[PDB]
Amino acid sequence: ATQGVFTLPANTRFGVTAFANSSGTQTVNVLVNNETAATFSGQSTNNAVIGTQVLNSGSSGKVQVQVSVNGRPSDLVSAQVILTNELNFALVGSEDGTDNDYNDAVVVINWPLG
């Protein structure tokens, strides 16, 4: 099944933040309406924030997270969670290798803001 794709409420500000836990340099692309809207990059094995940014979900609301390492797409897992019918998290983990800890890049999307 497709992972890393979320339908946010349209025209909505959301936060996207990425952490790294890998020897490989992580490249996180955030797509809005199928066009790149943000790219984070960095290396860390201690959960360093390699990027954080506020974006607008656009007219479609379609947000896609993609992760690659040295050109090679990472395997993705994802889910969305809603707390008290209001607070939203879109969660992404990725695996660039074989140990399957799926933390090599971790992406957290939250809304609403403000």
């Binding site: 020897s23 490989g24 340099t25 094995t45 040295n70």
Partner: peptide, 12 residues
């Protein structure tokens, strides 16, 4: 970070 940590950083 030890032998492995070096290889890691070195190769990637």
């Amino acid at each position: 970070x030890x032998l492995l940590x070096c290889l890691x950083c070195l190769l990637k």
